[PDB]
Amino acid sequence: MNIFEMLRIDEGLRLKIYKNTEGYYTIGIGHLLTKSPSLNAAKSELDKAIGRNTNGVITKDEAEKLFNQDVDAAVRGILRNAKLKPVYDSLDAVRRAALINMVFQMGETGVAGFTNSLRMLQQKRWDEAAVNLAKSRWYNQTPNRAKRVITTFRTGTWDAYAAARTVQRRLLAFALRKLIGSILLENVQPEDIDILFSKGVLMLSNLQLNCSFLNAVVSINFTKGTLRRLILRLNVTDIVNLNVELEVNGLSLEIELVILDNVVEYMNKTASQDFEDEVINEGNLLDSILQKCLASTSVLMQDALVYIGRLEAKLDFMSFSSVKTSRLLNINGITVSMV
């Protein structure tokens, strides 16, 4: 457990512009774009960071760079701030990380107003500090996160964020079951996803696509889609820094005539209710989970067959993965004919 992992737990990951815990405009892994309530004025900081017109969208590596950069700006601010630095110097890696988390969240200037609790931390009076922090606007903003950071301050270890990691695993399992369930016509039991989490791999064979799903996502008409094999893999060893591997072999699409964000929208309609019900029963959240999920996934596809109408396109192999304005789609072995 490092600071990056706990911050990844607290912020998650998002590709589109989202309103943070404070209500301000934010991108990536908790990178606050602007305080202004206008999206057009929010577009500035991002483009300034990259140096090219983006319309408010970035890549995963850019979000990671912005993440590390934001942590660097955080420690810069801590060392610059007069009230925080003595409190920080006295602390160990874990509590230092909690302080860094707070400064990361609420900015350098705002955090320095917690004079009472800072003074309480220099004297290493963890408990009364915790009780006092429990009564604060920061607790009102992020009660869960505040509970975790406070717990970190109190115990000085990594116990609080492990449970949150567990929760993330469970949520991810539900979201994945719903997603795969949506894409396919097959009934995916929680036990198979449990297989995907116990062992790094899960393979399903002789499936059939949900043409409604494809029609809604791609937005052109799909009549039928059959996939011979679907292989899914999770970075289970490091579930927080998520890496998903999706692979389809023997794809067979049939299309009639007469981007990914929409997927997130579709589920949001159909699943957010059921998902929230499931989470509540387990004791708009699905959007974040799905966003990080689809942002983390790398795609492989082999021996595909697509029909259009009828023309026939045969694809030997194709990969969809990140490279150095977005993810690269490298395709090989396309042969198109008739019958």
PDB file of C-alpha atoms in Angstrom, residues 75 78-79 81-93 96 99 122:
ATOM      1  CA  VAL A  75       4.386  17.757  -1.744  1.00  0.00           C
ATOM      2  CA  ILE A  78       3.224  20.967   1.783  1.00  0.00           C
ATOM      3  CA  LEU A  79       6.875  22.033   1.813  1.00  0.00           C
ATOM      4  CA  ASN A  81       3.110  25.883   3.415  1.00  0.00           C
ATOM      5  CA  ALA A  82       4.311  27.221   6.764  1.00  0.00           C
ATOM      6  CA  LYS A  83       1.759  25.543   9.045  1.00  0.00           C
ATOM      7  CA  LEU A  84       1.798  22.109   7.376  1.00  0.00           C
ATOM      8  CA  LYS A  85       5.532  21.435   7.000  1.00  0.00           C
ATOM      9  CA  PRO A  86       6.377  21.057  10.717  1.00  0.00           C
ATOM     10  CA  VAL A  87       3.353  18.786  11.160  1.00  0.00           C
ATOM     11  CA  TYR A  88       4.500  16.752   8.162  1.00  0.00           C
ATOM     12  CA  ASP A  89       8.172  16.424   9.134  1.00  0.00           C
ATOM     13  CA  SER A  90       7.204  14.769  12.424  1.00  0.00           C
ATOM     14  CA  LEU A  91       5.154  12.056  10.711  1.00  0.00           C
ATOM     15  CA  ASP A  92       5.984   8.610   9.337  1.00  0.00           C
ATOM     16  CA  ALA A  93       5.325   7.345   5.791  1.00  0.00           C
ATOM     17  CA  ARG A  96       2.573  11.527   5.940  1.00  0.00           C
ATOM     18  CA  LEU A  99      -1.635  14.345   5.124  1.00  0.00           C
ATOM     19  CA  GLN A 122       2.444  17.475  16.023  1.00  0.00           C
TER      20      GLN A 122
END
